[PDB]
């Protein structure tokens, strides 16, 4: 029917054929995970005024060490109204501006009080131990951020600090790439909803919840199309609904002779284009990837296998990277890390992928990757952390032994 | 004023003094990140019927290779009505039930349609999931304490358990204190700057998926602090504040916590960099324990401290058995002198081609990529005055790799 595709080729094909979505304007507070479609320029200096590093005293560095009059305190959030003449200081706290006349700051701990008024006990006089080089313990204007400079560049994938940066420079509206809306369905006449009691020959639909949760983890919005009957009429309806509401349509299950109603509907009815229908991998050989160009917009379509392990594995190898590209990330490829194999395993001729748990043991450089294999059985208090990427069988590698360095793909925030 | 606390002690103190929240019943579809407060038992076998692995034919293994009659197909959703006699097969698809009489399955590639030549050499049980292969009826599929991800939700879906008891999520209220702060939306005024910590903190705790409450900017004075803290306290489990002064008597916050709220302050300074001026307190109200953090105004301190102290505490509130962060070994990208205080740098983690350890690049620098970890520098000692590029160091993971 469809040629066996190399795992390398399937993955490359998925990224090339996956489009980058366009952009939209959002409020900074919604920037989490968004990629900036613009440079962001700072319109003020930070700090805007010279600011003390320490809690202490603003001094003249020509005066050197000695006894000084305290004229006042520099209040937080005010422009200082006094000015410092020789033989004078002003008390400062850490956020505070430096008054004109001072060129340096000295900590409280490098001083000792001489006099206090004791009519309300304000300080009058300070002995200033120490000599301070000019500039000492001051953030001059524009120390951290210089006016007009590019604080964040186009292509930047934002996290909490980046949002803080937007907040800092006053840029509360920003143009970012869109997030893919992702629609998910399950196909199969054997499937019942999770809420239903089992009936003869039937099982509960688990993939729909697993996939929606997976895509949710990355924070893209999703659409639940539910269970769909394995037949042209019912498929064409759900796909059309998925297509009008979403950028990505994902389906799990369905059969693949002439009962491949899905591949048949994609080709005949929707005139989609199917780039591959089988891939030389384990699990997930029966995976299908297609694109459909509608009104210039390109929607993308994945048909993953019914097997629950295949569904989650394929979702992570193919779907997430594609979604990452749609959202505007410059390298959407996953992080692959070296780890040490916890348990012996025979190799398949197909490259194989095992859900595994990553643990960094104290003072050991590499993490240990413990394969789950397996639907249940292997019980860890901890969610599967990565995909163990086993190589294909060769004559020099019939099996792999505990301790050997292997590639693990990181899946999900630890 | 308040004693300098060792970083080891501040962290231990935060975990001990942080309570675990109680539990509540949720729908499986909302399980992401929740910890199970119960064991979950499977009430059916999976598969419930013997199921074919391959698309192919169900056969008798006593009949070896040969020519066979095809009696029918086993439909996906249905109990098979026919039975397999010697010299017969039934067409099967993947996940379809096996009919009575067959003990093995053979792929299409090892071969309406009337007859099939079967190339075989097949052993009994071959390419069949017997009843209860994956899940056996009545067995514990997920244990109490399990911290759920998409697979776990799938497992709940599989075994029919759509309602489940989990620990609550902490509601976290955030404010900024300081007379110099304006909202991000405002234009600057003399002596004033924009409030950046409120957004950074709310976004951070949002990343972990706990609900938050924005109390906004609060004036640095007893009246205005007591109101916000009270509002935070009545609406939230955690109250976080950024900024405020702690020189002499202008520490209106520590003064309000002690005098007005009769909170208990476990530490007010910690021997670390950044974030020396950090404060942690608990307040026992009506038997419930609320927890309060006052982080430093410095934006770098805020995000560093939030990650070292707050997130772990929130993880515990949420019922996680080890709420401590993952620390990984990495290779130092840039030389650095050591401070006497243990220091913490926001850094980016990159795993380079075929190299076993990731490289940790301190921000101290316009990466396209959000800061991935906290570089945990050690404290200065006589044998470690500085650290050089290439040396193995501890990095704490703070977001998605």
């Amino acid at each position: 029917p469809f040629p066996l595709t190399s795992m390398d080729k399937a993955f490359i094909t998925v990224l090339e054929m996956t489009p980058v979505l366009g952009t939209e304007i959002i409020n900074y507070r919604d920037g989490m995970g968004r990629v900036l479609a613009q440079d962001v320029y700072a319109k003020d200096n930070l700090p805007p005024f010279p600011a003390s590093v320490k809690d202490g005293y603003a001094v003249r560095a020509a005066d050197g060490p000695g006894d000084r009059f305290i004229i006042g305190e520099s209040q937080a959030g005010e422009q200082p109204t006094q000015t410092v003449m020789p033989g004078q200081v002003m008390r400062v706290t850490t956020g505070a501006p430096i008054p004109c006349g001072a060129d340096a700051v000295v900590q409280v701990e490098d001083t000792e009080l001489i006099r206090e008024s004791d009519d309300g006990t304000e300080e009058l006089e300070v002995r200033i131990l120490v000599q301070a080089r000019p500039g000492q313990d001051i953030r001059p204007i524009g120390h951290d951020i210089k006016r007009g400079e590019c604080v964040l560049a186009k292509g930047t994938h934002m996290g909490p600090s980046e949002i803080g940066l937007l907040a800092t420079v006053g840029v509360t509206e920003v143009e970012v790439n869109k997030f893919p809306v992702v629609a998910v369905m399950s196909t199969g006449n054997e499937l019942l909803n999770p809420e239903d009691d089992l009936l003869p020959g039937k099982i509960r639909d688990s993939n729909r919840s697993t996939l929606l949760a997976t895509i949710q983890e990355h924070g893209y919005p999703t659409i639940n199309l539910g269970i769909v009957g394995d037949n042209p009429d019912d498929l064409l309806n759900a796909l059309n609904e998925g297509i009008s509401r979403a950028d990505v349509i994902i389906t799990s299950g369905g059969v693949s002779g002439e009962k491949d109603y899905l591949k048949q509907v994609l080709d005949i009815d929707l005139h989609a284009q199917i780039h591959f229908g089988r891939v030389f991998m384990k699990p997930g050989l029966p995976t299908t990837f297609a694109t459909l160009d509608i009104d210039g917009v390109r929607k993308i379509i994945f048909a993953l296998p019914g097997n629950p392990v295949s569904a989650v594995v394929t979702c992570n190898l193919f779907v997430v990277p594609a979604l990452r590209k749609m959202q505007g990330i410059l390298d959407p490829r996953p992080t692959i890390i070296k780890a040490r194999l916890s348990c012996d395993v025979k190799l398949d001729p197909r490259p194989e992928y095992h859900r595994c748990i990553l643990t960094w043991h104290h003072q050991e450089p590499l993490p240990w990757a413990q394969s789950t294999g397996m639907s249940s059985r292997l019980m860890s208090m901890r969610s599967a952390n990565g995909l163990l990427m086993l190589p294909p069988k060769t004559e020099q590698y019939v099996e792999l032994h505990k301790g050997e360095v292997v590639d693990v793909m990181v899946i999900g925030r630890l | 004023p308040f004693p300098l606390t060792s970083m080891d002690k501040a962290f231990i103190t935060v975990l001990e003094m942080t309570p675990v929240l109680g539990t509540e019943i949720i729908n499986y579809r909302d399980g992401m990140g929740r910890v199970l407060a119960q064991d979950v038992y499977a009430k059916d076998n999976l598969p419930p019927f013997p199921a074919s692995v391959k698309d192919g034919y169900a056969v008798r293994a006593a009949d070896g290779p040969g020519d066979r009659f095809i009696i029918g197909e086993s439909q996906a959703g249905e109990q098979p009505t026919q039975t397999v006699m010697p010299g017969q097969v039934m067409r099967v698809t993947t996940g379809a039930p096996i009919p009575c009489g067959a003990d093995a399955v053979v792929q299409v590639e090892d071969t309406e349609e009337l007859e099939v030549r079967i190339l075989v050499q097949a052993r009994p049980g071959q390419d069949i999931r017997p009843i209860g292969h994956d899940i056996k009826r009545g067995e514990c599929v997920l244990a109490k304490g399990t911290h759920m991800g998409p697979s776990e939700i799938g497992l709940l879906a599989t075994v029919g358990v759509t309602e489940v008891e989990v620990n609550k999520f902490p509601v976290v209220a955030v404010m900024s204190t300081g007379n110099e702060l304006l909202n991000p939306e405002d234009d600057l005024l003399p002596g004033k700057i924009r409030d950046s910590n409120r957004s950074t903190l709310l976004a951070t705790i949002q990343e972990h998926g706990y609900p938050t409450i924005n109390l906004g900017i609060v004036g640095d004075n007893p009246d205005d602090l007591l109101n916000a803290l009270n509002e935070g306290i009545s609406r939230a489990d955690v109250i976080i504040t950024s900024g405020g002064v702690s020189m002499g008597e202008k520490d209106y916050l520590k003064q309000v916590l002690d005098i007005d709220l009769h909170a208990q302050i476990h530490f007010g300074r910690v021997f670390m960099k950044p974030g020396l001026p950090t404060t942690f307190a608990t307040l026992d109200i009506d038997g419930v324990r609320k927890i309060i953090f006052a982080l430093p105004g410095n934006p770098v301190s805020a995000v560093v401290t939030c990650n070292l102290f707050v997130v772990p505490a929130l993880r515990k509130m949420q019922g996680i058995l080890d709420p401590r962060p993952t620390i990984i070994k990495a290779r130092l990208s840039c030389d650095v002198k050591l401070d006497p205080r243990p220091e913490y740098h926001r850094c980016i983690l990159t795993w380079h081609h075929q190299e076993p350890l990731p490289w940790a690049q301190s921000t101290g620098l316009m990466s396209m990529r959000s800061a991935n970890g906290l570089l945990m520098l050690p404290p200065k000692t006589e044998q470690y005055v500085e650290l050089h590029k290439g040396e193995v160091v501890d990095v704490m993971v703070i977001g998605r790799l």
Partner: peptide, 9 residues
């Protein structure tokens, strides 16, 4: 587990 930075001998 320790929350203060460590050197690797």
């Amino acid at each position: 587990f320790n929350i203060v930075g460590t050197t690797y001998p």
